[PDB]
């Protein structure tokens, strides 16, 4: 149900914004979009929750927003370490969630 | 840190057991192994937690166990619908988790 571009790129030191599009019953419906960073072989780590909040220990160069049915994650000061798969999720009511299929961010 | 076979197979109506091997500080360390079923484009769904407990609405043909550093998920009465990627996770102390890279179960 959530659409993410399969790939995105950015340059070392620069920014990248990636998108996650749903419907009025998930992303448009609630302010409960989360973003997950998954390095290779690791568990997906929450880097953003409630659209734009960062958990403890997540730097402020990660930010989130949403407008209409579209959520966005921006990463600034791109480091080689930021090359990972990024997933979005949203509540959809009924104690249930929808997920995107992830964006692989390549850092060049 | 958790090793799962990338692929496993079973026959319609029959069983499949898949494994998830860690160390004495995760899988051997605690009784907090979970298993997740991920159908294509869906969020990973908890089908087993605390090694062998099923959440509400998960059938009893899904079962879990663990011995030493090895956890196992068995699925009986295999249905075509059971073709999915299955992931394991374990606590590893410090409020932290480790994950496997998943097993794609092919139902023939």
Swiss-Prot record, chains A, B:
Region (Complementarity-determining-3): 89-97
Chief location bin: secreted
Cellular component, GO, one term: extracellular region
Cysteine disulfide links: 20-88
Renumbered residue ranges of the record's region Complementarity-determining-1: 24-32
Segments passing through the bilayer: none
Domain Ig-like: 1-97
Single GO MF annotation: antigen binding
Region of interest (Framework-2), residue spans: 33-49
Region (Complementarity-determining-2): 50-52
Biased composition (Polar residues): 64-76
Keyword vocabulary terms for this entry: Adaptive immunity, Cell membrane, Disulfide bond, Immunity, Immunoglobulin, Immunoglobulin domain, Membrane, Pyrrolidone carboxylic acid, Secreted, Signal
Annotated region (Framework-3), positions in chain: 53-88
Annotated localization: Secreted; Cell membrane
UniProt entry tagged with the keyword Phosphoprotein: no
Start and end residues of each stretch annotated as Disordered: 55-76
Biological function: V region of the variable domain of immunoglobulin light chains that participates in the antigen recognition. Immunoglobulins, also known as antibodies, are membrane-bound or secreted glycoproteins produced by B lymphocytes. In the recognition phase of humoral immunity, the membrane-bound immunoglobulins serve as receptors which, upon binding of a specific antigen, trigger the clonal expansion and differentiation of B lymphocytes into immunoglobulins-secreting plasma cells.
Subunit-structure text: Immunoglobulins are composed of two identical heavy chains and two identical light chains; disulfide-linked.
Name of protein: Immunoglobulin lambda variable 2-8
Organism: Homo sapiens (Human)
Residues of the full protein shown: 22 to 118 of 118
